[PDB]
Design brief:
The complex is a heterodimer of chains A (about 230) and B (about 180). Chain A is about 75% helix and about 0% strand. With about 230 residues, chain A is mainly alpha-helical. In chain A, α4 (about 30-65) runs antiparallel to α9 (about 155-165). Chain B is about 35% helix and about 25% strand. Chain B has helices at about 15-25, 85-105, 125-130, 140-150, 165-175; strands at about 1-10, 40-45, 50-55, 75-85, 110-115, 155. A 6-stranded mixed β-sheet of chain B has the order 2-3-1-4-5-6, with helices on both faces. Chain B starts with a strand and ends with a helix. Classes of the chains: A mainly alpha (about 230), B alpha/beta (about 180). At the A-B interface, α2, α4, α8, α10 and α11 of A face β3 of B. Chain A: It is found in: Cytoplasm, Cytoskeleton; Cytoplasm; Cell junction, Tight junction; Golgi apparatus. Chain A: It comes from Homo sapiens (Human). Chain A: This is Rho guanine nucleotide exchange factor 2. Chain B: It is a lipid-anchor.
Chain lengths: ~230, ~180
Amino acid sequence: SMEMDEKDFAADSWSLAVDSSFLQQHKKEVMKQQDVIYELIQTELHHVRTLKIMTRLFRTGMLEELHLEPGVVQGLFPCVDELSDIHTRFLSQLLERRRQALCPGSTRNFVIHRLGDLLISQFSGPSAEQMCKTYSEFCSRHSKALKLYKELYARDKRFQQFIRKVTRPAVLKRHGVQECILLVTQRITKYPLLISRILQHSHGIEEERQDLTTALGLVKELLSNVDEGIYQLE
Amino acid sequence: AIRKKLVIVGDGACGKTCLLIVFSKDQFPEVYVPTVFENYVADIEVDGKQVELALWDTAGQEDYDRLRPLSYPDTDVILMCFSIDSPDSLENIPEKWTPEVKHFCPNVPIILVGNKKDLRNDEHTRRELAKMKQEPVKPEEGRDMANRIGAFGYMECSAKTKDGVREVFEMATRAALQ
């Protein structure tokens, strides 16, 4: 990930991330709403980061160093380029919404008064149809992908070595091949929990409460549709 | 060091996310309590054994019965969480979470964890439960349930005060290693 964005979301909360003097000029409800918006962008930044580890570090590496069939790496990391493009674009919109909010003359101080609209466009229309179709494909191939990794690690020493080599950096402690596949599967269920907590502290404007309510309904609808179209493969 | 996977199950009432966050941070969140939990890999030394313990939550997955079982593969220990201020959450242990957990993972040690023990002497909880013709979960009920469900053990803790939290994750590590 880019040094600029890691530094921007390095703090454990929005109240810690902004300047202490800037925070002093805000209501508790604004700080509480902001912290959950900050967490949404933070965890979405970590999500795209996870997806880049799968495509550049694991998938690209297996094609380059291991000289392995493109069908096996496809069965190991299914739809990861599509998932990386869907979520990177979403992260870019969340990151630019934060940049517009920035006070003139500062890079840390911001307040996001509108989020709901952004969430609605992501969870409605062809962006949502792309997500339903891709996550239904990923969660079906998830079980086959976990069996495919184990058979390769406990059969071929070249792969056994590649895995140990690329997962040696301290940062990839919780991001091995298997943990990435689960982190991605678990990501979609985190949105209704995140949007629900933002909505809890967003009644100061009515159109924002109605935007976040419609986005919340859309994520739950997306999830219910993905769940229905899941068939486990072997 | 040997890696072991942990999954926590139970209704949202108990505070699965809270127990996982309090343990991984090893302090009750001061300024902000995080809404969600990703994953974590905690190095624990239990009885001279260096073990990498991967921590996973099932929060959000409660309504999605086809998406939730994808969290279970290769689990070495299941924390079966319930709330001491919610006797209804305990009633879901034998009828909802035990059949599902034993289906996907039949020989995985289950540790019935009664979280929110501090609320046993919180008069706002005793007062609200009196309206529902109920009272906080007694220690003997949580033990009776763990015995009925055939759990490896019964444990109690307070995510709010960190009391018992560490002992649960060390026993989870003992259970996984067997």
